[PDB]
Ligand binder design. Structure first.
Ligand code: AC0
Ligand code: MG
Length: 230
């Protein structure tokens, strides 16, 4: 019986659109009137960071701040603008203002909280995850928050899911994982026996739907699935 529902972060609870808007504002503040299109800087930053994150999926945890700051160091040297020593602090300030939840998130978390264990499982440093949940106003809505930093490994490594399950006191088969990445979220959680729900908000991933037990475009569908399973 489903006793716990676990959620991914980016693309699942906080929007990619807010992420992109937030990060453009970060680059605009980095650059000022430097003669570089902030959108061009952002696209190159995203290209490099995506490659780095891909390299480390499933692998031992390493600090994301060191990776992002090195990428920025490279980009500052490539393009000739002054490296921002306060890059991280700029980023935090912009997260607090421009971080954005999908419209149904609070409704969904509220409807589940109390009746099931409500958890988050995220690739993130712990302090950074807790700060952003606070900034979005949803920290209190979780019974557990489990991170790659705690487990020692990035998704889809089994230990990050194992830890979340152990925090909640449930078996994998008594738990659901909702996330937007078919490999890291659906495939990763399945290795622990969890029921996997792929969130495909824009229907962009039908190539990979077979990788999940269920497909949804809106998190309000989750509660119906759990009830139906129970
Ligand atoms: C994208 C970014 O700068 C960010 C995101 C979440 C929390 C803090 C910073
Ligand atoms: Mg995600």
């Amino acid at each position: 019986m489903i006793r716990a529902v676990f959620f991914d972060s980016l693309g699942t609870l906080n929007s990619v659109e807010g992420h992109a808007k937030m990060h453009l504002k970060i680059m605009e503040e980095v650059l000022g009137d430097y003669p570089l299109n902030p959108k061009t800087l952002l696209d190159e930053y995203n290209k490099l960071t995506r490659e780095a994150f891909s390299n480390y999926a499933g692998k031992p945890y390493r600090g994301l701040r060191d990776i992002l700051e090195e990428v920025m160091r490279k980009l500052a040297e490539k393009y000739g603008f002054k490296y921002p020593e306060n890059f991280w602090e700029i980023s935090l300030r912009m997260s607090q203002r421009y971080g954005e939840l999908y419209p149904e998130v609070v409704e969904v978390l509220k409807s589940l909280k109390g009746k099931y264990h409500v958890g988050m499982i995220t690739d993130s440093a712990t302090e950074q995850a807790m700060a952003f949940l606070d900034a979005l106003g949803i920290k209190d809505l979780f019974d557990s928050i489990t991170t790659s930093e705690e487990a020692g490994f990035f998704k889809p490594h089994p230990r990050i899911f194992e830890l979340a399950l152990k925090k909640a006191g449930v078996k994998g088969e008594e738990a659901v994982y909702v996330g937007d990445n078919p490999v890291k979220d659906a495939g990763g959680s399945k290795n622990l026996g969890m029921t996997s729900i792929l969130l495909d908000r824009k229907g962009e991933k039908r190539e990979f739907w077979d990788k999940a037990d269920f497909i949804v475009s809106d998190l309000r569908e989750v509660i119906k699935i759990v009830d139906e399973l129970n």
